[PDB]
Design a protein around this ligand. Structure first.
Ligand code: NI
Ligand code: NI
Length: 759
């Protein structure tokens, strides 16, 4: 419940809620009173209050009774930039803060309380964060995160008072369309979710990792690639000695500035050589000694000179630079600037305690808080308990060499800590699996970064989980989509007032074809063509991280696999993902039976090409030139910003429907037929007209004895059904098998399949 005061919320309050007389109850008669400059930030609470009270009349206004939000600069010394005071009295609720950020966090506390009980005990509490950056690294990199996923994620962060997200991503470039390999994000799309972040007080920081890890930017730009002594390039590394390559990077900085509002730029600066040696690129050492005037300048010096040049470039924009700590290397004739934020993750090189003592501001980008789809980390395998329950772990404990821990003593130079969300393999998990996978870690990190540690009343992680994690539901506004618009069944697929969709090997605009929708636990659909008996998939084309990213890539038919399981944490039993997840499709209700159809892992929309679409992928990729331009009417996948094609999905109209079922499910070779399997096929008249001369033709299959002759049903009446049986027995065939039966009635034709294991 709500008593003891504030014991079921995340983060826990950082001081005690002082009780007062009486209570206050949210009803449909209340108003959220706030100054107009706070309208967008209060909107979340307004929408939630209507959800909680099961009505729609509550509004945000500059006057009224109920919940008052007050922004008062006089409180800046007491509350800081993010603190607030929450006061509950019989007369109403009052949130006071010095700025918008703090007032918003106050509404999250209030919201979590009302999420559990509409009646609140009277009292007051002042709450302030222990650390200024309470963060997440989201690698929306190479593979894509749908805008709907990002929108939900900002709500997840906001309700937990997380306020910083580093987003490694590609923004579609206006000046370099040849480098616009998917994944990319539209400028309007980023502006949108950045606007939501601004309202929720979340600092969205972009990262273009450089001068290494640039495959996604340099694949099609060989002249900006660092070259071997043999002249062999590599899309991973930008030539930092080439003036047009530096211009190319700085141009991307400019393009991002128009959509991101943060004061920070993250250039990455992961170790340049990526494990190689500077001696294989002697033009770096020579470039260094030129810009410094020192004969003994090294390759690492050029690397650092690059960091400093980008530091000056972003500083001239009033921005502050950020780098990964493995970019802090040993130098000679060039010294690393001291006004750069260092995000520490690697237990190597200069210790974080000495970095802090030397004046650097640090983020604990802790390896213990890493997430990956490919190889789950221990926090995924085992949950956060091994950290929560370890009194020697905390935001101020950084990783050191040889598994040692290093406590940063100059605590004022610790900005905070964050968890990290890496793909590594884009098809092993879906994004909807990731949003579930990180659930516990988001709460744990939110708790230790806001509170500075564990709640005083939850000695163990089990207590924290039982009393808080399991009791605090997400905001009711978190979910933003109908996760299952259509129920499982048989449907048709076509264009609005156009041809239907068929698929045999390849897909095309056919006409008159049946499909079977099968929902999945992570809220996707398997699209099974009931004529080809194969499932719609996307597996052919240019790839990143084992995921098809080519624009205009051609969906194709693939063997239908099991789609009933989802995998998080340890991902025990996760096999077959290479076929499963490319087979999965998100279906977004477009109204009036129309549907946006988006692949679950390539995240491009099933589309009908026009012959007028332009993109680099239509001519070349990664130095190899090949034309893949789709022609008018061709079926392809397209990013959201190159197609509006939706698809009409409707339950089938066919007057006939056939179903084939095998009994037993297993068959064995037999000379007397005892090991046979009876495939009963049942035809059904759906509409109102007597169908006659219904012919059922059995399949023919290697190594199986099957009844050769078709069976016929003279007549079947509306709303009736007829049954015919065929017997199948394996000869030399063994293993999984499938039997397809063709049912014909006049001009109409349908199929029914069955499975038999040959043992
Ligand atoms: Ni790397
Ligand atoms: Ni779910």
């Amino acid at each position: 419940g709500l008593v003891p005061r504030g014991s079921h919320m995340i983060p826990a309050l950082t001081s005690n809620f002082k009780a007062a007389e009486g209570s206050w109850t949210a009803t449909q008669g209340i108003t959220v009173v706030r100054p107009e400059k706070f309208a967008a930030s209060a909107q979340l609470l307004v929408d939630e209050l209507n959800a909680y009270t099961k009505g729609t009349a509550i509004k945000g206004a500059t006057a009224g009774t109920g919940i008052e939000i007050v922004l008062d600069e006089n409180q800046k010394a007491d509350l800081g930039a993010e603190g607030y005071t929450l006061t509950i009295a019989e007369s109403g609720v009052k949130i006071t803060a010095a700025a918008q950020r703090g007032a918003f966090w106050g509404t999250r506390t209030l919201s979590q309380m009302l999420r559990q009980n509409l009646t609140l005990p009277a009292g007051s509490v002042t709450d302030k964060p222990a650390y200024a950056e309470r963060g997440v690294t989201l690698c929306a990199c190479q593979i894509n995160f749908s805008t709907e996923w990002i929108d939900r994620f900002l709500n997840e962060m906001a309700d937990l008072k997380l306020n910083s997200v580093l987003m490694e991503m590609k923004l579609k470039s206006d000046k370099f369309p040849v480098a616009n390999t998917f994944s990319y994000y539209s400028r309007d799309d980023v502006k949108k979710f950045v606007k939501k972040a601004e309202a929720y007080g979340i600092d969205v920081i972009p990262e273009i990792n450089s001068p290494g890890h640039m495959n996604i930017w340099l694949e099609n730009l060989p002249d900006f690639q660092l070259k071997d002594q043999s002249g062999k390039g590599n899309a991973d590394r930008l030539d930092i000695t080439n003036p047009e390559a530096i211009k190319f990077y700085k141009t991307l900085i400019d393009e991002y500035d128009g959509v991101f509002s943060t004061k920070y730029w993250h250039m990455g600066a992961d170790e340049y050589m990526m494990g190689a040696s500077y001696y294989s690129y002697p033009q770096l050492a020579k470039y260094a000694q030129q810009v410094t005037g020192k004969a003994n300048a090294t390759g690492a010096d050029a690397f650092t000179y690059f960091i400093n040049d980008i530091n000056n470039y972003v500083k001239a924009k009033g921005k502050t630079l950020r780098i990964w700590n493995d970019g802090i290397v040993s130098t000679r004739a060039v010294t690393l600037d001291k006004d750069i934020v260092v995000e520490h993750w690697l237990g190597s090189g200069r210790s974080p305690n000495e970095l802090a003592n030397d004046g650097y501001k640090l983020v604990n980008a802790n390896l213990n808080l890493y997430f990956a789809r490919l190889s789950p980390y221990p926090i995924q395998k085992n949950g956060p308990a091994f950290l929560y329950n370890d009194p020697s772990f905390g935001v101020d404990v950084f990783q050191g060499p040889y598994s040692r821990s290093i406590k940063v003593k100059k605590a004022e130079n610790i900005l905070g800590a964050k968890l990290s969300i890496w793909p590594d393999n884009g098809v092993k998990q879906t994004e909807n699996e990731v949003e579930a996978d990180v659930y516990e870690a988001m709460r744990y990190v939110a708790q230790i970064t806001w509170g500075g540690g564990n709640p005083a009343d939850n000695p163990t992680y089990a207590d924290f989980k039982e009393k808080r994690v399991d009791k605090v539901k997400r905001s009711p506004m978190w979910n933003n989509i109908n996760r299952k618009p259509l129920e499982d069944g048989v449907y048709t697929i076509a264009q609005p007032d156009g041809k239907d969709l068929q698929l045999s090997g390849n897909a095309s605009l056919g006409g008159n074809d049946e499909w079977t929708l099968t929902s999945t636990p992570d809220h996707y659909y398997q699209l099974k063509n009931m004529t080809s008996n194969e499932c719609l998939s996307v597996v052919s084309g240019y790839k990143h991280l084992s995921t098809v990213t080519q624009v205009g890539a051609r969906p194709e038919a693939r063997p239908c696999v099991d789609v009933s399981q989802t995998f998080t944490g340890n991902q025990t039993g996760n096999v077959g993902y290479e076929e499963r997840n490319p087979q999965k499709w998100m279906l977004l209700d477009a109204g009036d039976g129309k549907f946006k159809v988006v692949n679950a892992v390539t995240l491009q929309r099933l589309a009908v090409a026009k012959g007028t679409e332009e993109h680099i992928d239509f001519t070349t990729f990664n130095g190899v030139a090949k034309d893949t331009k789709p022609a008018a009417g061709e079926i392809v996948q397209f990013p959201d910003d190159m197609t509006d094609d939706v698809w009409t999905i409707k339950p089938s109209t066919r007057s006939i429907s056939a179903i084939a079922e095998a009994t037993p499910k297993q068959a064995y070779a037999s000379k007397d037929g005892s090991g046979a399997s009876t495939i009963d096929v049942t035809v059904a008249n759906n509409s109102k007209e007597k169908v006659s001369n219904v012919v059922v033709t059995p399949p023919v299959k290697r190594g199986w004895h099957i009844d050769k002759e078709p069976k016929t049903i003279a007549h079947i009446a509306p709303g009736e059904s007829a049954k015919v049986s065929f017997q199948v027995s394996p000869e030399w065939y063994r293993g999984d098998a499938q039997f397809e039966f063709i049912v014909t009635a006049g001009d109409e034709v349908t199929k029914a399949s069955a499975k038999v294991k040959a043992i």
